[PDB]
Amino acid sequence: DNPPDPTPAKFFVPIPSHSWAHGTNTSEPTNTLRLDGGVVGVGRSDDIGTSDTA
């Protein structure tokens, strides 16, 4: 079977990039340079505290 998919085509507004201003409380679509793909971060322990920037 190859049924047709006639559902109307939605609008969409092209833009070159994401928000340049936003720093918090959001996600950021990006092309990461990892072998892995996924939400991944560098490991930590007590040897390395949390960020001290408060």
Added chain:
Amino acid sequence: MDRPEGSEERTVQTSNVVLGETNIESQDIASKEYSPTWDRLASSEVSDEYPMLTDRWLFWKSVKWEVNDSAFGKMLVQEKFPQSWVQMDVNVNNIPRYTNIPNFIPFNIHQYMRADFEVKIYVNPNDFVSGWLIMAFLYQGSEMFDYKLRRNPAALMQMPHVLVNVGAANEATLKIPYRYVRPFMRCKDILRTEPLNMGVLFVEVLIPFRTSAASSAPKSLDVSLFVKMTNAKFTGMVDGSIALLSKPIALP
């Protein structure tokens, strides 16, 4: 003084050293204290601990500062640390050697180490002189692209420090948890980095030292420094002569 002996002194004993202190200290910690965990990831050999040797306090220098030479921010001590304390014992050629001092005896036979330090500073003026000193420590300060703008005592007031008021004549204790770019430091010049260079310890002259105009008054005052290691772990047993020490480089 109200008793036959002057008063009750207070005693701080570690290993076979005992340090008397008559006043309230001034303390600070260079960063948050923790228990090392990733250091086990670096070495498959058991880390050796020598608590009877290394926990012991050790007299390091005496630096003399005079009335005629106290600027604002004249540096009494500017040293790569622990490098200067551990390599303090030099032969005739100013080549250090880890063999004499019993705290430093395990630096001789190992390659890498890790440990926390506590530096304690002592000034014994009489009552009628007044001054003020700041002793601060900058983690790996010598490798910093502007290390020579941070020597002003206005910059030291920000990094972890203690203050020694000469009018009150207090003690001061600066705890320094081990922090570094790698889980261990090198003990000698190997694999051709300087050995045991974790930071820079400063002693500046926050308020210049002042005395009375009388002729017999002391125009000088001494500053003494004691250091001790805490969680010292050594790894990588080798021969004592397999690597060499060369005379240290000084800071500008």
